[PDB]
């Protein structure tokens, strides 16, 4: 009652090929749903559309979320990572929950408990991979509120179906904590590939030796010239002079077309095309927007003004509203770095013959809007950001391809387990506060590169300003001014 | 060999979100104020529980080859056509209509991770918009593998 | 080694992305190597 059950640990230890980041925050857990389990569906919200239909349950439990890179990395630590390294990935995890303080509306309740458990069998719906709000704050001095746990299951309209499963979280064993008890657990990340925090210094089509002719031939002329019966077969050899027709081993990665929207509003068509012109996929009669979708370059060289409609991850700025905010409020990320191995999001993949030519038939070629996997493709996954998620859960299925998640990060069959917490019902008006420390060990891949000229680095702006970036203003509000991608250093393709 | 999976998912691919929480991601919600010349703008909104079709997702449903809802889908080998049977694993019909079946038993347990057999995989832009040209799309009648897909095998 | 607890990110020495006829600190078409600008060593920061 008079002794502390834990201390405040925040730092980062950079050791050799590994990184160890520790973060401690203060939290507040209110009594969600008056200790009750309430069914929820679009009908409770009115159910305006079939695409927006849902069915599920809301629970009194809260949960801890630290699925964003900012919870573990300061802006200096993230700069230190992305400038010096070719790759990283999580190895170990440690979580601690301590200094429990229960209140009653305000006085203390010493005899109340707080139930906490982890699901290590992954028997509950995993909500930590959907990029939800409620994460531990970027700035250590912020006291944050724990998000409520709720899940969804099979629906038909607003109605349920027989196969729908119902989950009571009180049906798990859970540790109970008075003001002197503490909760802790350790997690081992399963083996995942290193995130590639680098940008290629070569393009897939330029891999050739520019000084030498190939020994392979292509068809240069099909006709001798103007006239009748001019048909001929003329084969020039592919070489430095014409690099477009050379024979190549590998082809660019897959594509799914997206609409290009200009950041200069005068350029955009004067019509409402946000949903009608969007690229989507359909599942059981419902059309879900394709967001962000497969990894593709945001734009062609020299066109940074445009961005794919849904193809980018768009964050908010500090104090930005929920609905219909102005364009200067958002932060749009560009994925140009992968432009060397990946097709542009807003461009077609290529062309294919649509017919057989003959003396009576001219050669026809149609555009390829989407191109799935082909033997010999290579591609780059989406980049990870300081504001973006870390891991995702690979859906348990008979098969998958390249399970790496589409919002970026590490696809894991057994990701970090969900951490469920709630106040014990006693009802008496009650809430609890306390401390949370999370510690992840990261693995690093150093660059041995022989590049002669200096790299591109992430750097703080040189010029004076009213505020300094990634710091509090005069009111005490902390704001992240920009997104920070991971890819600066370069490799050979 | 892998164990054959013998269970039906209770969760749809597009409904893995926490219904109670907003996403920190944004989407373009408005392109025009409307009903006038030069009414152009970019308005963005939080993807959230009220609009669940626009939210960002880490995984997308499996590959598909279209079938006629009940003209046969086919594959050519050495010039000789062949019916596609049974073909890739897909949902036999959309939920609520049990009378229709693919041209070539029901698989409906897999409709969570797999596209309906007789439905298009989705839509893709076919052009660049501009002030002169409106946006266009076109239906995807077949989709090979893409990274980030998940699917169920066929039931035994 | 740099031990700093500074929260916000540093100034760093970085190459500029904007396109150019030549690469900085590289040969030109004639074979002549050049050094574009003087590079000092002071970028990271310490307290006084």
């Amino acid at each position: 009652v008079g002794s502390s059950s834990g201390n405040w640990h925040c730092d980062s230890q950079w050791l050799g090929d590994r990184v160890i980041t520790t973060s401690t925050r203060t939290w507040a857990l209110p009594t969600y749903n008056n200790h009750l389990y309430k069914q929820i569906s679009n009908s409770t919200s009115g159910g305006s559309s079939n695409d927006n239909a849902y069915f599920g349950y809301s629970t009194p439990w809260g949960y801890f979320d630290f699925n964003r890179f900012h919870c573990h990395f300061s802006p200096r630590d993230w700069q230190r990572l992305i400038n010096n390294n070719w790759g990283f990935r999580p190895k170990r995890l440690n979580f601690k929950l301590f200094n429990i303080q229960v209140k009653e509306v305000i006085a203390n309740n010493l005899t109340s408990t707080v139930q906490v458990f982890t699901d290590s069998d992954y028997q509950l719906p995993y909500v930590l991979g959907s990029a939800h709000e409620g994460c531990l704050p970027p700035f250590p001095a912020d006291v944050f509120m724990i998000p409520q746990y709720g899940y969804l299951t099979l629906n038909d309209g607003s109605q349920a179906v027989g196969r729908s499963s119902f989950y009571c979280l009180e049906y798990f064993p859970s540790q109970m904590l008075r003001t002197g008890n503490n909760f802790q657990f350790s997690y081992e990340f399963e083996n995942v590939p290193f995130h590639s925090s680098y940008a290629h210094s070569q393009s897939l089509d330029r891999l050739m030796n520019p000084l030498i002719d190939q020994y392979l031939y292509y068809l240069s002329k099909t006709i001798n010239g103007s006239g009748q019966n001019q048909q001929t077969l003329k084969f020039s050899v592919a070489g430095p002079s014409n690099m477009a027709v050379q024979g190549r081993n590998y082809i660019p990665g897959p594509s799914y077309r997206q609409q290009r929207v200009s950041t200069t509003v005068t350029q955009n068509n004067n019509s409402e095309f946000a949903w009608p012109g969007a690229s989507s996929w359909a599942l059981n009669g419902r059309n879900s927007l394709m967001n962000p979708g497969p990894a593709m370059a945001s734009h062609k060289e020299g066109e940074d003004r445009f961005f794919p409609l849904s193809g980018s991850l768009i964050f908010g700025k500090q104090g930005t509203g929920r609905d219909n905010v102005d364009a200067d409020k958002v932060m749009i990320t560009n994925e140009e770095e992968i432009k060397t191995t990946n097709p542009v999001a807003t461009e077609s993949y290529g062309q294919v013959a649509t017919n057989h030519q003959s003396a009576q038939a001219q050669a026809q070629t149609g555009w390829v809007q989407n191109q799935g996997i082909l033997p010999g493709m290579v591609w780059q996954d989406r980049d990870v950001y300081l504001q973006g998620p870390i891991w995702a859960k690979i859906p348990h299925t008979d098969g998958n391809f390249h399970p790496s998640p589409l919002m970026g990060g590490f696809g894991m069959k057994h990701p970090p387990p969900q951490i469920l917490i709630k106040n014990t019902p006693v009802f008496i008006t009650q809430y609890s506060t306390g401390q949370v420390s999370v510690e992840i060990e990261w693995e690093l891949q150093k660059e041995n590169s022989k590049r002669w000229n200096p790299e591109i680095q992430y750097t703080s702006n040189y010029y004076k300003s009213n505020n300094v970036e990634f710091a509090v203003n005069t009111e005490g509000v902390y704001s992240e001014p920009r997104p920070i991608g991971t890819r600066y250093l370069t490799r050979n393709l | 060999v892998p164990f054959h999976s013998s269970y039906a998912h209770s969760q749809s691919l597009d409904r893995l979100m926490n219904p109670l929480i907003d996403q920190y991601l944004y989407y373009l919600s408005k392109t025009i104020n409307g009903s006038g010349q030069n009414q152009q703008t970019l308005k963005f909104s939080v993807a959230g529980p009220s609009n669940m079709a626009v939210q960002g997702r880490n995984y997308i449903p499996g590959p598909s080859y279209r079938q006629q809802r009940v003209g046969a889908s086919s594959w050519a080998l050495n010039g000789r056509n062949s019916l596609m049977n049974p073909g890739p694993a897909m949902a036999s019909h959309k939920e609520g209509e049990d009378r229709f079946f693919p041209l070539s038993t029901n698989e409906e347990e897999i409709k969570t991770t797999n596209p309906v057999a007789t439905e298009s995989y989705g839509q893709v832009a076919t052009n660049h918009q501009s002030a002169q040209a409106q946006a266009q799309t076109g239906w995807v009648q077949n989709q090979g593998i893409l990274p980030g897909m998940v699917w169920q095998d066929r039931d035994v | 080694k740099e031990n700093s607890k500074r929260w916000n990110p540093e100034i760093q020495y970085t190459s500029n992305y904007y396109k150019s006829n030549n690469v900085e600190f590289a040969v030109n078409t004639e074979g002549v190597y050049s050094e574009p600008r003087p590079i000092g060593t002071r970028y990271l920061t310490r307290n006084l």
């Epitope: 950041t263 200069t264 005068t266 350029q267 940074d304 102005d326 200067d328 409020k329 | 703008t41 970019l42 | -």
Partner: antibody, heavy 128, light 108 residues
Framework: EVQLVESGGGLVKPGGSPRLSCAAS????????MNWVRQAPGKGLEWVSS????????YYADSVKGRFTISRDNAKHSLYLQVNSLRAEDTAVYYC??????????????????????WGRGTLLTVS | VLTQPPSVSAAPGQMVTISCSGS????????ISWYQQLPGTAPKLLIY???ERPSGIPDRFSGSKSGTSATLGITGVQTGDEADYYC???????????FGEGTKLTVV
């Protein structure tokens, strides 16, 4: 079609306070960044101030900084420049400039990349 | 600060080249635009995003940015093309928009 009209200009003695209103018509004034550019008689034009669509970002030139205030009204389709402590150097023709690009605030962090695609006729302001 | 030659003068049908030197903070860093102003009229945009040309602007006008300096090139000069020219960009050190000193083009 698209037009910008500047009014409020006239002859005012030094220390007087005037207010320059820029009325827009023909497009959606709510989604564009707005600017004030002045040109002193027989001299090159000078940028004065800028305001964002939501009027959250406001920049001033150093010469006018602290004595000039810029406000924008989206409902009345009007841009406002309030003037205080007028000085002889304040004689100019005040142009209302429109910036179509939002790219400085959402896609680029290092650079603004502004340009002015639409200009008002301008209103003269003389101090005597 | 953007620096332009105070005047340029060429006979009709002759190439005219107007260039304004800039510091690393402004021209090297940002896209530069060119504005041409007639004697009795307000400025009109000529070139934006270094080389891009607005609709209603003739092909003769062209622009390019190399290193810290951007040059506006006019070919097939005409009597009607005589007007003041300004190159402007956002300057990061100053944190304000800067216009060039101006360049008077005069055809004889």
């Amino acid at each position: 079609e698209v037009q910008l009209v500047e009014s409020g200009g006239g002859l005012v003695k030094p220390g007087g306070s005037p207010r320059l209103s820029c009325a827009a018509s023909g497009f959606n004034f709510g989604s564009y960044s707005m600017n004030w550019v002045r040109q002193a008689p027989g001299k090159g034009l000078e940028w004065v101030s800028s305001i964002s669509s939501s009027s959250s970002y406001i920049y001033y030139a150093d010469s006018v900084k602290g004595r000039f205030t810029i406000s924008r009204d989206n409902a009345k389709h009007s841009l406002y420049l309030q003037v205080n402590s007028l000085r002889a150097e304040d004689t100019a023709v005040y142009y209302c400039a429109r910036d179509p690009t939002t790219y400085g605030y959402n896609s680029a962090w290092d650079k603004k990349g502004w340009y002015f695609d639409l200009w008002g006729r301008g209103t003269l302001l003389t101090v005597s | 600060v953007l620096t332009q030659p105070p005047s340029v003068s060429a006979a009709p049908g002759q190439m005219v080249t107007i260039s304004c030197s800039g510091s690393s903070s402004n021209i090297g860093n940002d896209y530069i635009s060119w504005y041409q102003q007639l004697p009795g009229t307000a400025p009109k945009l000529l070139i934006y995003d270094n080389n891009e040309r607005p609709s209603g602007i003739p092909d003769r006008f062209s622009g390019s940015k190399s290193g810290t300096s951007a040059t506006l090139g006019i070919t097939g000069v005409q009597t009607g093309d005589e007007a003041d020219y300004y190159c402007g960009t956002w300057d990061s050190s100053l944190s304000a928009w800067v216009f060039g000193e101006g360049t008077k083009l005069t055809v004889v």
